[PDB]
Amino acid sequence: THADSLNNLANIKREQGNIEEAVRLYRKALEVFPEFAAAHSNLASVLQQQGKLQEALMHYKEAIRISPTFADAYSNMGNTLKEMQDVQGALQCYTRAIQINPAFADAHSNLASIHKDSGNIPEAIASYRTALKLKPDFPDAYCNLAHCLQIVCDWTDYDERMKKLVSIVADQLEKNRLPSVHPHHSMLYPLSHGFRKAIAERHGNLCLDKINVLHKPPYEHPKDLKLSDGRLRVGYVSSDFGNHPTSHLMQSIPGMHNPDKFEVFCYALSPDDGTNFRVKVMAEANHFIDLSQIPCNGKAADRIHQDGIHILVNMNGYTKGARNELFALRPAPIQAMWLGYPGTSGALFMDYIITDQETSPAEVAEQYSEKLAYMPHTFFIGDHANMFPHLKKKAVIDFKIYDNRIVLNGIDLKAFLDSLPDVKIVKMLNMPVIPMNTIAEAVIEMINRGQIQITINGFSISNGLATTQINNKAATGEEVPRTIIVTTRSQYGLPEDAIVYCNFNQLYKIDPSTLQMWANILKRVPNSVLWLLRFPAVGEPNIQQYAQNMGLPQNRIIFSPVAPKEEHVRRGQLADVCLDTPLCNGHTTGMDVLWAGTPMVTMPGETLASRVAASQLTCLGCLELIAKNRQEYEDIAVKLGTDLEYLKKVRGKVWKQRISSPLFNTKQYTMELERLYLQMWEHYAAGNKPDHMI
């Protein structure tokens, strides 16, 4: 009873976020009563929260030795093992907890979450429904279930589901509980801007609570650039220096920084995955520090302070692998959110968010806890000019003239074309056309028979479906292909004689409203098709069914598998038009379609995430592809699918402007980012505090 009062106090101290005081009290409980199963399990749980995973495991096992049927200890032990990447151990614990007590809702929810993470969405949904049957008031299970349903485009009772998510968040905010909607997912649901901001703020708060155990004073920050020989020391912090979308966007940026005025430190939160992405940032940054080797956030943050960083740049936000505890400790006088996270941090510890006028207009500035720091064009950038230079030019084969039926790309394309007798040059600067011919017939035969490659006139000619067999680093975008590649509509079962609208996003970004718009467009344009991905495959029959109920026959939507990075980008050349997802736009995916020369129709919303595509298109200089409402989006899209001369014009415009605009110009981007960094620095060095920048 003395023991229980200590334990109960510790429990409350924990819920409040006084982690140190909770630990101290559980240990007191165990001094007074060593065989206290619950106190061991609760201490284990808080040690797990602090990263002390082995010490946690020890206490969970003591709890179970004391009470062999303590299902809750097994459930929480399972979470600890999952955090240590021991999936097998985790499943053994979850299944043991459910065997002890089949009515234990939390264990069902934990099992569901590991099914989800493993790619077993139907089993995750099933386990979440068991949890909700057992305990109907269970916000974590309801919101995680809602995300599973989103992932597979299960829209059963969609509008009441959405109302219920909002309702749960309202209730959770007013009670100062951690909201069950993850900040990253909050963009997909019709929550208020205040709610989205508050969800983010509460998640940042978990990092503040974790760093308080350390007892660190404020760090003292540079007031001038004297220790760094007049150089601004910029620190980029990311878990994604490796094969990840964010590296596919910004891997050239570190090495393009002006070493006369900047000194670049890249802090990796992940170990080296062996990829060229990681090799490049390690080689080209002035300094590369692997913080994955420094688990303790205190020691890791000290390193950033003694490197003397002026601007620390958060590339994760609330994405996997983040360590925002590093930014909670404020080791640098200016802390900015950049590129990797398409939302606000909600946190006081972040000063700016780097964005732009189109993406985040001054009006909607109360979305963000940060001050707006505008790049002059778009804050978005892509490494496509360096990664896929073989797509800078193309040739076609005239089967029956189309730009997107049978396409050739390669670094040595020019020399191959010059080896051929009868090549026609169509001005657009230009598109070589190989006529139907023995050579043209040899190529089409390789494709129709699914062969890997052939040789024509000494040139290597590769089937675009076989890139991982020819050169797996070229397939991933780690190397530029060294062969000429052939890409065709026939490879993907797309019609030779109709308009192909595409969208290559994960299926979770589609909602009922969006698919209704796409169905309207397809009905207005006979024979045309919508080209989607199995992303994941189990989303396919749901999409097809909701489209059938809207009046489209099944043949109007063609699904392809997710491809390796280079194939994905290359095959966008086969589409006529990309239809962007208004709920959450293609971000990296948007840069990808534009690099192929494919116009993208978008309807910007209010969230940062719903406005990225329109910012890209503005920078690109194609204002005619931005819709102000649903009717406009459909008219634009139908116009592009019926007015074939206007299609040819708009495509020609995207094809040229991907080079002549700033969109993919990483040097210009880096230089503009450098100016913006100096503004931020001077503003502060002159005694001022963070303010908006335009």
């Binding site: 993850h182 900040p183 990253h184 997912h185 094969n243 990840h244 979308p245 964010t246 609330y318 994405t319 996997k320 990797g340 994960q506 997710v562 971000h587 990296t588």
Partner: peptide, 7 residues
């Protein structure tokens, strides 16, 4: 195999 942005 295909890396993506995740929560």
């Amino acid at each position: 195999v295909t890396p993506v942005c995740t929560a």
